[PDB]
Amino acid sequence: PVSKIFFEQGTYQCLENCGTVALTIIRRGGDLTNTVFVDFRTEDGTANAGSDYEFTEGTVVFKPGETQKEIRVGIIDDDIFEEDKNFLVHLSNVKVALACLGSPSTATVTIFDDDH
């Protein structure tokens, strides 16, 4: 019986000025009385850390009973008009009973430009 860890949705969106984007990680399956650890980390798409979004990483803990965890990523605003850009948040290193990654364990985040 295997706990799976995955993002609640595979795609998130925000405007450049949204300040931060919230992402939800689900735990489903197996024995929910176990504690589960999952690492997370941003990766550039066409949007770049230090420029369009803030580099973010960490470990999330699903304590017993917990099925939903929220993580936040900083979005950087500017006043230049350009195309919409995306980046990635990968999940990894799941630790418990067996727990592992499900689908999707990468979320893609599109920042929509709000200028012009």
Nearest 10 degrees: CA dihedral of 43, 47, 53, 56? Answer: 0
Q: Binding-site residue total for Ca ion (CB under 5 A)? A: 8
Q: Which of 12, 14, 16, 27 binds Ca ion (CB under 5 A)?
A: 16
Q: Least Å distance between CB 53 and Ca ion? A: 9
For Ca ion, the binding residues in 31-60 under the rule CB under 5 A are 52
Q: Which residues pair with 112 in a beta bridge?
A: 15
**Integer CA distances (angstroms), 54 to 41, 57, 61, 73, in order:** 11, 10, 22, 7
For Ca ion, the binding residues in 73-92 under the rule CB under 5 A are 77-78, 80
Q: Least Å distance between CB 86 and Ca ion? A: 12
Nearest 10 degrees: CA dihedral of 44, 46, 50, 55? Answer: -30
Q: Least Å distance between CB 110 and Ca ion? A: 10
Other beta carbons within 10 Å of 40: 22
Site map 97..116 versus Ca ion, x via CB under 5 A: ----------------xxx-
Q: Least Å distance between CB 108 and Ca ion? A: 17
Residues that bind Ca ion (CB under 5 A): 16, 52, 77-78, 80, 113-115
